[PDB]
Amino acid sequence: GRYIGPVCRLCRREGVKLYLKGERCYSPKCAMERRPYPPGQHGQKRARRPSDYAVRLREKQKLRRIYGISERQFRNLFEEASKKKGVTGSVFLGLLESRLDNVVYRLGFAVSRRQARQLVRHGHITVNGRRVDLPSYRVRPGDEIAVAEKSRNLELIRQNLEAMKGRKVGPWLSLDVEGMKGKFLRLPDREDLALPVNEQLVIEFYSR
Amino acid sequence: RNLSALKRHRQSLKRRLRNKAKKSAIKTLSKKAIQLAQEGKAEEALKIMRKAESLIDKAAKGSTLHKNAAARRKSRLMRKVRQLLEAAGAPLIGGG
Amino acid sequence: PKKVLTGVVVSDKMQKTVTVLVERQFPHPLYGKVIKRSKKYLAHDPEEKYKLGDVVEIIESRPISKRKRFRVLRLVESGRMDLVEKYLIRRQNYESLSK
Amino acid sequence: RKERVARLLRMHANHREEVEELKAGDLGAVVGLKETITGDTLVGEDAPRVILESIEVPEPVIDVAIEPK
Amino acid sequence: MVKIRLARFGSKHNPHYRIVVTDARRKRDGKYIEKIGYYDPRKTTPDWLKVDVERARYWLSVGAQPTDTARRLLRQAGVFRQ
RNA sequence: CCGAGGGUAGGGCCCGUGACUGGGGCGGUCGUAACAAGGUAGCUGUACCGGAAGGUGCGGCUGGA
RNA sequence: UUGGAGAGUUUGAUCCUGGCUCAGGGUGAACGCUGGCGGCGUGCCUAAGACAUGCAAGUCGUGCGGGCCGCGGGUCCGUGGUCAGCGGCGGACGGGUGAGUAACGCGUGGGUGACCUACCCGGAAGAGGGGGACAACCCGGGGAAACUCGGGCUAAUCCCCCAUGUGGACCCGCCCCUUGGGGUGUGUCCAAAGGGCUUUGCCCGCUUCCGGAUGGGCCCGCGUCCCAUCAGCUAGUUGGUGGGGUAAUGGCCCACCAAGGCGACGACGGGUAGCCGGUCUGAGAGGAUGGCCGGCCACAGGGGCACUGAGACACGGGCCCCACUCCUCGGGAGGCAGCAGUUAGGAAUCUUCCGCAAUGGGCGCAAGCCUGACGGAGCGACGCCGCUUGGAGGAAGAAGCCCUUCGGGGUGUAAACUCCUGAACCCGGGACGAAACCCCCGACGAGGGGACUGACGGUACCGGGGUAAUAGCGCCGGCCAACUCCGUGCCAGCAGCCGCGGUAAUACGGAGGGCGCGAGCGUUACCCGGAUUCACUGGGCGUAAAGGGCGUGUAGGCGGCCUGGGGCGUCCCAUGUGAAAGACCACGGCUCAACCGUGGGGGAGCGUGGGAUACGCUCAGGCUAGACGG
Ligand code: SF4
Ligand SMILES: [Mg+2]
Ligand SMILES: [Mg+2]
Ligand SMILES: [Mg+2]
Ligand SMILES: [Mg+2]
Ligand SMILES: [Mg+2]
Ligand SMILES: [Mg+2]
Ligand SMILES: [Mg+2]
Ligand SMILES: [Mg+2]
Ligand SMILES: [Mg+2]
Ligand SMILES: [Mg+2]
Ligand SMILES: [Mg+2]
Ligand SMILES: [Mg+2]
Ligand SMILES: [Mg+2]
Ligand SMILES: [Mg+2]
Ligand SMILES: [Mg+2]
Ligand SMILES: [Mg+2]
Ligand SMILES: [Mg+2]
Ligand SMILES: [Mg+2]
Ligand SMILES: [Mg+2]
Ligand SMILES: [Mg+2]
Ligand SMILES: [Mg+2]
Ligand SMILES: [Mg+2]
Ligand SMILES: [Mg+2]
Ligand SMILES: [Mg+2]
Ligand SMILES: [Mg+2]
Ligand SMILES: [Mg+2]
Ligand SMILES: [Mg+2]
Ligand SMILES: [Mg+2]
Ligand SMILES: [Mg+2]
Ligand SMILES: [Mg+2]
Ligand SMILES: [Mg+2]
Ligand SMILES: [Mg+2]
Ligand SMILES: [Mg+2]
Ligand SMILES: [Mg+2]
Ligand SMILES: [Mg+2]
Ligand SMILES: [Mg+2]
Ligand SMILES: [Mg+2]
Ligand SMILES: [Mg+2]
Ligand SMILES: [Mg+2]
Ligand SMILES: [Mg+2]
Ligand SMILES: [Mg+2]
Ligand SMILES: [Mg+2]
Ligand SMILES: [Mg+2]
Ligand SMILES: [Mg+2]
Ligand SMILES: [Mg+2]
Ligand SMILES: [Mg+2]
Ligand SMILES: [Mg+2]
Ligand SMILES: [Mg+2]
Ligand SMILES: [Mg+2]
Ligand SMILES: [Mg+2]
Ligand SMILES: [Mg+2]
Ligand SMILES: [Mg+2]
Ligand SMILES: [Mg+2]
Ligand SMILES: [Mg+2]
Ligand SMILES: [Mg+2]
Ligand SMILES: [Mg+2]
Ligand SMILES: [Mg+2]
Ligand SMILES: [Mg+2]
Ligand SMILES: [Mg+2]
Ligand SMILES: [Mg+2]
Ligand SMILES: [Mg+2]
Ligand SMILES: [Mg+2]
Ligand SMILES: [Mg+2]
Ligand SMILES: [Mg+2]
Ligand SMILES: [Mg+2]
Ligand SMILES: [Mg+2]
Ligand SMILES: [Mg+2]
Ligand SMILES: [Mg+2]
Ligand SMILES: [Mg+2]
Ligand SMILES: [Mg+2]
Ligand SMILES: [Mg+2]
Ligand SMILES: [Mg+2]
Ligand SMILES: [Mg+2]
Ligand SMILES: [Mg+2]
Ligand SMILES: [Mg+2]
Ligand SMILES: [Mg+2]
Ligand SMILES: [Mg+2]
Ligand SMILES: [Mg+2]
Ligand SMILES: [Mg+2]
Ligand SMILES: [Mg+2]
Ligand SMILES: [Mg+2]
Ligand SMILES: [Mg+2]
Ligand SMILES: [Mg+2]
Ligand SMILES: [Mg+2]
Ligand SMILES: [Mg+2]
Ligand SMILES: [Mg+2]
Ligand SMILES: [Mg+2]
Ligand SMILES: [Mg+2]
Ligand SMILES: [Mg+2]
Ligand SMILES: [Mg+2]
Ligand SMILES: [Mg+2]
Ligand SMILES: [Mg+2]
Ligand SMILES: [Mg+2]
Ligand SMILES: [Mg+2]
Ligand SMILES: [Mg+2]
Ligand SMILES: [Mg+2]
Ligand SMILES: [Mg+2]
Numbered sequence A: 001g002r003y004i005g006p007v008c009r010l011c012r013r014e015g016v017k018l019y020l021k022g023e024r025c026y027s028p029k030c031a032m033e034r035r036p037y038p039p040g041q042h043g044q045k046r047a048r049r050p051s052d053y054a055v056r057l058r059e060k061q062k063l064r065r066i067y068g069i070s071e072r073q074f075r076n077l078f079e080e081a082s083k084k085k086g087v088t089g090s091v092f093l094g095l096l097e098s099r100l101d102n103v104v105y106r107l108g109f110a111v112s113r114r115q116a117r118q119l120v121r122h123g124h125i126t127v128n129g130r131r132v133d134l135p136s137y138r139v140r141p142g143d144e145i146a147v148a149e150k151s152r153n154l155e156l157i158r159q160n161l162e163a164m165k166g167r168k169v170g171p172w173l174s175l176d177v178e179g180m181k182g183k184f185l186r187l188p189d190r191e192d193l194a195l196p197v198n199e200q201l202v203i204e205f206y207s208r
Numbered sequence B: 001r002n003l004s005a006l007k008r009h010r011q012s013l014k015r016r017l018r019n020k021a022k023k024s025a026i027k028t029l030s031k032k033a034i035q036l037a038q039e040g041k042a043e044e045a046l047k048i049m050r051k052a053e054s055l056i057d058k059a060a061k062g063s064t065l066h067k068n069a070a071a072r073r074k075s076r077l078m079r080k081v082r083q084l085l086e087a088a089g090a091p092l093i094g095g096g
Numbered sequence C: 001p002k003k004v005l006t007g008v009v010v011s012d013k014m015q016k017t018v019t020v021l022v023e024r025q026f027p028h029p030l031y032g033k034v035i036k037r038s039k040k041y042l043a044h045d046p047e048e049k050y051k052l053g054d055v056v057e058i059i060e061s062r063p064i065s066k067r068k069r070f071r072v073l074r075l076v077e078s079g080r081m082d083l084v085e086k087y088l089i090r091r092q093n094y095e096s097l098s099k
Numbered sequence D: 001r002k003e004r005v006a007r008l009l010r011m012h013a014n015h016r017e018e019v020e021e022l023k024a025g026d027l028g029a030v031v032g033l034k035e036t037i038t039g040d041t042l043v044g045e046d047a048p049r050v051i052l053e054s055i056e057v058p059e060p061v062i063d064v065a066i067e068p069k
Numbered sequence E: 001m002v003k004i005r006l007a008r009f010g011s012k013h014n015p016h017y018r019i020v021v022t023d024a025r026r027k028r029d030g031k032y033i034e035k036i037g038y039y040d041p042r043k044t045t046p047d048w049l050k051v052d053v054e055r056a057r058y059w060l061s062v063g064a065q066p067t068d069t070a071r072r073l074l075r076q077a078g079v080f081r082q
Numbered sequence F: 001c002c003g004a005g006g007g008u009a010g011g012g013c014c015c016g017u018g019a020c021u022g023g024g025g026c027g028g029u030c031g032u033a034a035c036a037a038g039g040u041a042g043c044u045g046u047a048c049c050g051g052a053a054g055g056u057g058c059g060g061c062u063g064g065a
Numbered sequence G: 001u002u003g004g005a006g007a008g009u010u011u012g013a014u015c016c017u018g019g020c021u022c023a024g025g026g027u028g029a030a031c032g033c034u035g036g037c038g039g040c041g042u043g044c045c046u047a048a049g050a051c052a053u054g055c056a057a058g059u060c061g062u063g064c065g066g067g068c069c070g071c072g073g074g075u076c077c078g079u080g081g082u083c084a085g086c087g088g089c090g091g092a093c094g095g096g097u098g099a100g101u102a103a104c105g106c107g108u109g110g111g112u113g114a115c116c117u118a119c120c121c122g123g124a125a126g127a128g129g130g131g132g133a134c135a136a137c138c139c140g141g142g143g144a145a146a147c148u149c150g151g152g153c154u155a156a157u158c159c160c161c162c163a164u165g166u167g168g169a170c171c172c173g174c175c176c177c178u179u180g181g182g183g184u185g186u187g188u189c190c191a192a193a194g195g196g197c198u199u200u201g202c203c204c205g206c207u208u209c210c211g212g213a214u215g216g217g218c219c220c221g222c223g224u225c226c227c228a229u230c231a232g233c234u235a236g237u238u239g240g241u242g243g244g245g246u247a248a249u250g251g252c253c254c255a256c257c258a259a260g261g262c263g264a265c266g267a268c269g270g271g272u273a274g275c276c277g278g279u280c281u282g283a284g285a286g287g288a289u290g291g292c293c294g295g296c297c298a299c300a301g302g303g304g305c306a307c308u309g310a311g312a313c314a315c316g317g318g319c320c321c322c323a324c325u326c327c328u329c330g331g332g333a334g335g336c337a338g339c340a341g342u343u344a345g346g347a348a349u350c351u352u353c354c355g356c357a358a359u360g361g362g363c364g365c366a367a368g369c370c371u372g373a374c375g376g377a378g379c380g381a382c383g384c385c386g387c388u389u390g391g392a393g394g395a396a397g398a399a400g401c402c403c404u405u406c407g408g409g410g411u412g413u414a415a416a417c418u419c420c421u422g423a424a425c426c427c428g429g430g431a432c433g434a435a436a437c438c439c440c441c442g443a444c445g446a447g448g449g450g451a452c453u454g455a456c457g458g459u460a461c462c463g464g465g466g467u468a469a470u471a472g473c474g475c476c477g478g479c480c481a482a483c484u485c486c487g488u489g490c491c492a493g494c495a496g497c498c499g500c501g502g503u504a505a506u507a508c509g510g511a512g513g514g515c516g517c518g519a520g521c522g523u524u525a526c527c528c529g530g531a532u533u534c535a536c537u538g539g540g541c542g543u544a545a546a547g548g549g550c551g552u553g554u555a556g557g558c559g560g561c562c563u564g565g566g567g568c569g570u571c572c573c574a575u576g577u578g579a580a581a582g583a584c585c586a587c588g589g590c591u592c593a594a595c596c597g598u599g600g601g602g603g604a605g606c607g608u609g610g611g612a613u614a615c616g617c618u619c620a621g622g623c624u625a626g627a628c629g630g
């Protein structure tokens, strides 16, 4: 299954705060603040000039590690993209983002995708009032991303729902708070989202 | 160590005997009838030819001769009997 | 339809049968270029009327013998002994492709 | 190594009797096995993978050389 | 004789027939003469039967006989109504 | 009559194997043919000779002077 | 216009040529180390070696007669079990395998005026009379078995004759039509079988003939591997006349006449191979492949053969030869390339399972019986797909370990620790797959209504409760993402190519660290790719590999300017074919996906008809710039 190990190190290698830890990421106690060099015995060693493969390799793990996902599943999504109409990179982020477990995080139901994935695998979420635990459920335009209403009386949805009364879910989402629901209205535009990811470097990688 | 297969085999032998039996007589008769046409013996030919003719179609009734078979047999018995008699005619009685 | 084909009589030295050589053309499936190829058909002449030179049409017909499966349809042209040489001079040439 | 135990036989004076089980403290012959050799412990699949006490004793006493002509 | 019967497709525990016309002595799921409409015995979607009743008549006329449960879904959508 | 095949006899192709022998490849002994005009320009087809490289005759080539 | 990346290694250095090598995708895989759950798939590639044992094809008492067991009562009749037997239909389907086959076997498009098709469905006619055989059972030999023999009685939808002739068949003739297609006239020739119930009629049956349907057989064009260090082949050979054979054309077979037939466009011969839909790879063109599934073929230990039949030269039918094996003196027995299983070979390949509940096949009127087809279950990371080993907080940062200029650095928010969730498990409920066949009203029809039936399965899923709960493998000189310390000292070893190891090795071994993948990671084998390195797309030959020593000429390929006819190539439109699964786009079912369902879009390619005429082709006239001549 998923990456599961020490997760700061991901960010320290990648030279970019990926906001994996969620609640802690903004603290001065994150690792990227105190030491933003790569993990392990050799980070404070004056880094060396990176090859093109490297550059696209690092760029790729970057995108991948963000959504916290198996290189298997990642590549297969990606393949779906190329064959699908029009702009590959965009449709990639699209399908990357049209996946459930990450939705739940976009809608702040949970702190991080990790925490989100748990929530989703646990039956604590439902699309359309049908209970759905598979973190790879590609959500399609029109879906009602409920919280399980028998999961409602639960300290942690509350806490996170509570810090979500009037922040802004991106242009494609619609958190009716209080009632625990929300909605998937639009597959993202490229501009719709900024991640520290050159959408193109990744296409150039899988071209080798 | 089983069957009604052997029952089938059992039967076929009984059947075989009969197909073979009728089949013989046809040839025997056709040949005989034909024979007479080479000497003719106009009357006697046809008489046998008749009997040949008949024993033919009769056998086509069952699994012995296909219709198209009996059809061929007569078709050739006939041509042969008429043509021989063409050498010294006198066709009487009837079968042509 | 009964395939009709057109060709020259190259052998009539048979008895109620004539050999009809048939060219066809088509493009090479890999190299585009048009190429000729050919085939000798044993052809039924029940009234022996066809002879050397006689470019004719023959038609797909029911079997008459082993390897006769066409009968001549209609005399189309006459005396093309240039084509007849064009085929003897090739045949003949064979006597020096041996060892 | 895993191994299928097809049939179980008791050997009598005159005939071979098939039997559907063989309890503890008893002897019989199992048909089906493929890799098992003598002095090899055998356990049901979902059980402690214990190895029975082996056996062990005498070293060979006489030695003879063989020449592959 | 020529027949109308259910030619299974789909997958394991997902029956998905395809009531069909084919020579009696084919494999169940082998080369058929004509497809005259499906059938989903599990009832998983609004269309768990659509006999081409235009076609399904033509056959019955010229010979074709049918399963004691071919006709079941042939009657069910009435190829028999007077 | 034909006929599985059996048998007699003589052939063709293939494969394996064989005392011994021929060179070929891979990992000390003799000389110094080639690379500098390489110490006789080199190479060449052929031919005869020579432990060996090679030498020599005749002709050719320059990719030599 | 949804499609195309390159690197390393020849020198002191360079450019070019050129080979080698690597990254990628794929698999019926196998091997190592490791391994938790589940879904769909999938699983003897080898010895088409040999097989123990069970099972895999039967059904009908509504075709007929019988031997035994009964049950209401007067050795009787009745009826239903029951074992055969005669008799029907099936057993030619379905299931297995790829040996043989380089072939009309297959693919694709056609031909049959050269043909067949049980059951099924339409339509027309008929079902009169008389006769007769064999099993069963009774009698009696032989055998230790297989099991057989001879004599004697017996039924029928079994067997034959006569009549009926709607009609069919054949000879001759004639009308049409053109290969044997349809009509007609005379002669001749041919049909049948009964059972059933509620009995002045319905139900299943049988006969001849016509048409349909589906299934076939045979024939033809075109496509289908390697060697020319295989170059010539051929006597049933090629053609003919007559005849046999068949459902039917044919040298299919036979007798005779003729002297032919085939071959560098590759005959003959040798090798290898079942083909296709498809699959994999590829930018494409192309290369490679044909296991699972669907279509055709071929085979049933090795051969040959025919019988019965609508259909077979018949996988679990028959005969005969051969090899092998088993049984206990005349002989008998066997054929898992059906399902499981065994044995052997092998790197390697599963349960002697469950059920006929579903779908489909056989038989019967029906109830029903039979089905190792099939529906499911088990085993296997073999493949793909989903899922878990947790989530939030948690130090200027514990211990141990690695490094160090000795100050510090790293593993590392990682751990401990707080808390939130709650895989497994525990209880409770619990399926869809199954509505027909049949019974009832109607009319045994249309419509209506009622009943029985679930292997998987107490499984999926639902509902309640509910424990922090497996991680491993490859790499870290360059290609190529990832670096230090010790050990070692051309040793031990690494290695795909360069090359690394001779005391300070980022290249061996261990450690800490790191990179990549993660129930997997690697390795070997092989296919396509990079290989534009067989070059059609898309290469080359002065010196790199590569111009024939030079002519003359055969076939072949190619071919100037003008006008015209044809329209073969070529272009265009129509139409048929191009099965299903697949692939592609859309939607939809399983919570998702894999898997799967429904619809859409079709193309090459070939048939058929119409059209165009520039280029090429052919034919017909003219030219003189090429060429030859004076
Ligand atoms: S906390 Fe800082 S270090 Fe840890 S993940 Fe969030 S961003 Fe990276
Ligand atoms: Mg709860
Ligand atoms: Mg790629
Ligand atoms: Mg006699
Ligand atoms: Mg017969
Ligand atoms: Mg008949
Ligand atoms: Mg002839
Ligand atoms: Mg002989
Ligand atoms: Mg012989
Ligand atoms: Mg013999
Ligand atoms: Mg030899
Ligand atoms: Mg020297
Ligand atoms: Mg010199
Ligand atoms: Mg010299
Ligand atoms: Mg020199
Ligand atoms: Mg010399
Ligand atoms: Mg000497
Ligand atoms: Mg000398
Ligand atoms: Mg000289
Ligand atoms: Mg020089
Ligand atoms: Mg590349
Ligand atoms: Mg080198
Ligand atoms: Mg050099
Ligand atoms: Mg060097
Ligand atoms: Mg190179
Ligand atoms: Mg590529
Ligand atoms: Mg393994
Ligand atoms: Mg299951
Ligand atoms: Mg399975
Ligand atoms: Mg096999
Ligand atoms: Mg294979
Ligand atoms: Mg046995
Ligand atoms: Mg009986
Ligand atoms: Mg039969
Ligand atoms: Mg084969
Ligand atoms: Mg051959
Ligand atoms: Mg062919
Ligand atoms: Mg063909
Ligand atoms: Mg029959
Ligand atoms: Mg009687
Ligand atoms: Mg009569
Ligand atoms: Mg002859
Ligand atoms: Mg003839
Ligand atoms: Mg004939
Ligand atoms: Mg012949
Ligand atoms: Mg003939
Ligand atoms: Mg002669
Ligand atoms: Mg040719
Ligand atoms: Mg061979
Ligand atoms: Mg083969
Ligand atoms: Mg290419
Ligand atoms: Mg197949
Ligand atoms: Mg055979
Ligand atoms: Mg055989
Ligand atoms: Mg065998
Ligand atoms: Mg045999
Ligand atoms: Mg059989
Ligand atoms: Mg047989
Ligand atoms: Mg056969
Ligand atoms: Mg068998
Ligand atoms: Mg088996
Ligand atoms: Mg072994
Ligand atoms: Mg096995
Ligand atoms: Mg299996
Ligand atoms: Mg059943
Ligand atoms: Mg049934
Ligand atoms: Mg069974
Ligand atoms: Mg699994
Ligand atoms: Mg997986
Ligand atoms: Mg400090
Ligand atoms: Mg520490
Ligand atoms: Mg410290
Ligand atoms: Mg943590
Ligand atoms: Mg709790
Ligand atoms: Mg049910
Ligand atoms: Mg009634
Ligand atoms: Mg329960
Ligand atoms: Mg629950
Ligand atoms: Mg823990
Ligand atoms: Mg690796
Ligand atoms: Mg790599
Ligand atoms: Mg590097
Ligand atoms: Mg030191
Ligand atoms: Mg040492
Ligand atoms: Mg190593
Ligand atoms: Mg060192
Ligand atoms: Mg050194
Ligand atoms: Mg090292
Ligand atoms: Mg290395
Ligand atoms: Mg290659
Ligand atoms: Mg290529
Ligand atoms: Mg090459
Ligand atoms: Mg080229
Ligand atoms: Mg080149
Ligand atoms: Mg040179
Ligand atoms: Mg020259
Ligand atoms: Mg020469
Ligand atoms: Mg010329």
Ligand SMILES: [Mg+2]
Binding pocket: none
């Ligand atoms: Mg011209």
Ligand SMILES: [Mg+2]
Binding pocket: none
């Ligand atoms: Mg020309």
Ligand SMILES: [Mg+2]
Binding pocket: none
């Ligand atoms: Mg045209």
Ligand SMILES: [Mg+2]
Binding pocket: none
């Ligand atoms: Mg298709």
Ligand SMILES: [Mg+2]
Binding pocket: none
């Ligand atoms: Mg869906």
Ligand SMILES: [Mg+2]
Binding pocket: none
């Ligand atoms: Mg479709």
Ligand SMILES: [Mg+2]
Binding pocket: none
């Ligand atoms: Mg002219």
